[PDB]
Amino acid sequence: GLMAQMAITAAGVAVGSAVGHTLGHAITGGFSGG
Amino acid sequence: GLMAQMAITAAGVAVGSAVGHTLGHAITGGFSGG
Amino acid sequence: GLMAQMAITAAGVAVGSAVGHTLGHAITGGFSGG
Amino acid sequence: GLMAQMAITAAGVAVGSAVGHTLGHAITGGFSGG
Amino acid sequence: GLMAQMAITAAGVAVGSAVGHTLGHAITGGFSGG
Amino acid sequence: GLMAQMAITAAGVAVGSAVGHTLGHAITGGFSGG
Amino acid sequence: GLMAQMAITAAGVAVGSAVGHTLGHAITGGFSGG
Amino acid sequence: GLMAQMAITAAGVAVGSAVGHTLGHAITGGFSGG
Amino acid sequence: GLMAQMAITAAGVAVGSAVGHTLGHAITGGFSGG
Amino acid sequence: GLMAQMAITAAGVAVGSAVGHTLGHAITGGFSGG
Amino acid sequence: GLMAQMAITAAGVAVGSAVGHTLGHAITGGFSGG
Amino acid sequence: GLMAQMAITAAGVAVGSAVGHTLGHAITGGFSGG
Amino acid sequence: GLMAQMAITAAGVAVGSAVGHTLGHAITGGFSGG
Amino acid sequence: GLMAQMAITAAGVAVGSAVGHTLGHAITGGFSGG
Amino acid sequence: GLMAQMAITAAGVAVGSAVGHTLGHAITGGFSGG
Amino acid sequence: GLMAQMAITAAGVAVGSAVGHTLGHAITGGFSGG
Amino acid sequence: GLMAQMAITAAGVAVGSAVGHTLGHAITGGFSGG
Amino acid sequence: GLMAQMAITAAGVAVGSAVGHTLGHAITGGFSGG
């Protein structure tokens, strides 16, 4: 029984082009993870 | 019995082009994950 | 018995072009996940 | 017996073009997921 | 016996073009999922 | 015996063009899913 | 039973080109991880 | 039962080109990890 | 049961070219790791 | 002005079960394609 | 003006089960493609 | 103007199970491709 | 103007299970590719 | 103008299980590639 | 204008399990590549 | 204009398990590469 | 214009386990490379 | 214009475990490289 607060599971990834945010956390301001 | 607060499961991914946010968390402001 | 608060399961993904938000969380303001 | 608060299951995905929000959560304001 | 609060099951997806919201949650205001 | 609060099951999907909301939840205001 | 506050699991990654943020944490402002 | 505050697990990585932030922490401002 | 405050685990890495920040911590301002 | 000697264009495909020949060429004997 | 001697274009494919030949060339005997 | 003697273009592929020949060339005997 | 004697282009591939020949050339006997 | 005698282009590959031949050349007998 | 007698181009590969031949040349008998 | 008699180009490779032949040449008998 | 009689180009390789032949030449019998 | 009779180019290699032949030449019998 595993837990993931933020999970992005992509086994096969092939990106020809990606301008800007890509598969990440663009967090701004606040985030209460405690 | 696993739990995922934010899950994006994409086994086969092939992106020709993606300008801007792509498969991520563009979180702004607040998020209570505790 | 697994649980997913936010689940986007896409086995085969092929995106020719995607300008803007794509398969993500554009969360703004608040979100009570506790 | 699995549970999914937000589920978008799309086995075969092929997007020629998608400008704007696409297969995601454009959540603004509030969301009580606790 | 599985449960899905929000389910969009589309096995074969082929989108030539989709401007705007597409196969997602454009949630604004509030949502009591607890 | 499965249950789906919001179910949109479309096996074969082929969208030539779709401007605006498409196969999603344009929820505004409130929704009591608890 | 493992836990991941921020998890991005991508087994096979092949990026032809990616200008800007890519598979990371662009955190600005604050983040309460304690 | 392992825990990862920030985890980016990518077994096979092959980047043809990546200008800018790539698979890292572009943290600015503050971050409470204690 | 191991813990990693900042973990970037990439078994196989092959970077053809990467101009700028790459697989690191571009921390500016503050970070409370105590 | 494109030409296709054998064309089977099916944008959205969802096959629950298919025992035997399925969406292919079961060519036996001869075929003069020159 | 492209040409395809044998073309099977299926953008979105989702096969639950397929016993036997599936989306291929079961060529036996001869085929003059010169 | 491209040409493909044998083309099977399937952007999004998701195969739950496939016993036997699947998306290939089961060529036996002869084939004149010169 | 590219040419492919045997082309199987599948951008997004996700195979749950495949016993036997899968996305290949099971060539037996002869094949004149000169 | 490139040429490929045997081409199997699969950008995003994710194989859960594959017993037997998989994405290869099971050539037996003869093959005239000169 | 490049040429490939045997080409298997798979950008993103993620194999959970593969018993037997996998992405190779199981050539037996003869092959005239001169 | 490069040439490859046997080419298997896989940028991102992640193999959980592979018993037997894997991404190689199991050549037996003869092969005329001169 | 380079030539490769036997080429296996895999930029990012991550093998969890591989019992038996793996990314090599299991040549037995004969091979005419002159 | 370089030539490689046997080339296995793997930039990033990370092998957790590999019992048996691994990234080599298990040549038995004969090989005419002159």
Q: Nearest 10 degrees: CA dihedral of A16, A19, A22, A27?
A: 180
L11/B14 touch (CB, cutoff 8 Å), yes or no: yes
From B28's Cα to the closest Cα of chain L, the distance in A is 32
Sign of the torsion formed by the C-alpha atoms of P4, N22, M10 and Q17: negative
Could you tell me if I12 lies within 8 Å of chain R, comparing CB atoms?
Answer: yes
Best probe of the N interface among O2, O13, O28, by most N CBs < 10 A, is O13
- P-chain residues near H11 (CB < 8 A): 14
CA separation, residue H2 to residues A2, G1, G4, H34, N30 (Å): 10, 7, 8, 17, 54
Would an 8 Å CB–CB cutoff place B18 in contact with chain M? no
Q: Which chain F residues touch J15 with a CB distance below 8 Å?
A: none
Q: Name the CA dihedral angle for I6, B26, D19, D8, rounded to a multiple of 10 degrees.
A: 80
C-alpha Rg value of chain E to the nearest Å = 13
Question: Token pair 């696409």 is at which residue?
Answer: D22
Which chain O residue is nearest to residue A13, measuring alpha carbons? O12
Q: Which residues of Q touch R26 (CB under 8 A)?
A: 21, 24-27
Instruction: Tell me if Q32 and P29 make a contact (CB, 8 A cut-off).
Output: no
B-chain residues within 8 Å CB-CB of M14? 11-12
CA distances to G20, J32, R6, R29 from J29, in Å: 56, 10, 39, 39
Q: Which of L10, L25, L32 sits opposite K13 (nearest CB)?
A: L10
How many angstroms separate the CA atoms of Q27 and Q21, rounded? 11
The experimental method, as deposited, was cryo-EM
Nearest to I13, CA basis, from E29, R10, G19: R10
Query: Would the CB atoms of N13 and A13 count as touching at under 8 Å?
Result: no
Question: What is the structure's resolution, reported in angstroms to one decimal?
Answer: 3.1
Contact criterion met (CB below 8 Å) for P25 and O28: no
How many residue pairs from chains H and O have C-beta atoms closer than 8 A?
A: 5
Cα-flanking dihedrals φ and ψ of residue J2, to 5°? -95, 155
Q: Give the residue from K19, C22, R17 showing the smallest Cα distance to D19.
A: C22
Is any Cβ of chain G less than 8 angstroms from the Cβ of Q10? Answer: no
Please state, as a whole number, how many other Cβ atoms lie within 10 Å of the Cβ of residue K20: 17
Q: Which two tokens stand for residue G5?
A: 């506050």
Contact L14 C14 (CB under 8 A): no
Cβ contact D10–E17 (<8 Å): no
G5 burial level (CB within 10 Å; 0-12, 13-18, 19+):
buried
The amino acid that residue K21 corresponds to is H
CA pair distance E22, E15, nearest whole angstrom:
10
Residue of P nearest to Q10 (CA): P10
Helix locations, chain R, DSSP H: none
Q: Is I26 exposed, middle or buried (0-12, 13-18, 19+ CB in 10 A)?
A: middle
* O28 min Cα distance to partner chain N (Å): 5
All residues of chain C having their beta carbon less than 8 Å from the beta carbon of residue K13 are 12
8 Å CB contact of N11 and C14: yes
Interface check B14 vs L, CB under 8 A? yes
CA distances to J21, L31, M1, O30, R32 from P31, in Å: 33, 19, 31, 5, 10
Tokens of D6: 């937000």
> Does residue N30 contact residue P32 with C-beta atoms inside 8 Å?
no
Angstrom distance (rounded) from CA K28 to CA L17: 25
Distance separating alpha carbons of residues F34 and G10, to the nearest angstrom: 33
Q: DSSP string spanning A17-32?
A: -EES--SSB--EE--B
Distance CA N30, CA I25 (A): 56
Q: Are P26 and R25 in contact (CB under 8 A)?
A: no
The helix/strand/coil state of D10 is coil
The residue of chain O nearest to residue G16, with distances taken between CA atoms, is O11
Rounded CA-CA distance L4/A4 in Å is: 45
Is the minimum CB–CB distance between J2 and chain E shorter than 8 Å?
A: no
Short-list G21, D18, H30, I18, CA closest to B26 = G21
| Distance spanning both ends of chain C, measured CA to CA | 20
State whether residue P15 is helix, strand or coil.
strand
The span from the CA of D7 to the CA of D15, in Å, is 19
Nearest by Cα to N5 from Q14, Q25, M31, F15: M31
The whole-angstrom separation of Cα M11 and Cα L11 is 5
Could you give the dihedral angle defined by the CA atoms of residues A9, A12, A18 and A20, in that order, rounded to the nearest 10 degrees?
10
| Structural tokens at position D31 | 């969301």
- Whether chains R and F touch (3+ CB pairs under 8 A) is answered by no
